[PDB]
Amino acid sequence: NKVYLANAFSINMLTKFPTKVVIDKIDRLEFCENIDNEDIINSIGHDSTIQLINSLCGTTFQKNRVEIKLEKEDKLYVVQILTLEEILKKVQFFEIIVD
């Protein structure tokens, strides 16, 4: 089981077919809880994104692009849409689980 963070989900991440995926819209509390750990693989490359999540979840990610390829049992966490004030200002958080 590996767990990724990105700004979107794409069909291009899936390796095996046919594949079942469960998708849920989650709140900021759930989102910050599950991304705040050592094993999560960050694939968000825009700094403004990286700041937005570091501000709202009090984490320390650095902009790091990776081409992620999801396998059975992998999880993907997605944020969709600076300084503190701006970040507080529209945003959604999703959880994607592969089977």
Add this chain to the structure above:
Amino acid sequence: NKVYLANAFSINMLTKFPTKVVIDKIDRLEFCENIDNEDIINSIGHDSTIQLINSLCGTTFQKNRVEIKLEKEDKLYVVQISEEILKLYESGKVQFFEIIVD
């Protein structure tokens, strides 16, 4: 139920959460067989993509842009884009996918 034709899949297309989708990579034969039908809903807005599909499947779609909103049981057929359109399809950068929603 509704069946769409698109050039992308997006989380915003889903109406209820949590939701499950089954995704399959299909070949040209199954793709063209499933979109060559009366009640399909064409969401593709570019002419490049639409003549490419028509060339390949022998269909006669038109550039029609729509906001897709998938509910339970709806199906989506996607042409996934990873001179300009021909380069991608013959570079091995265009693939075809079946998405059934739950």
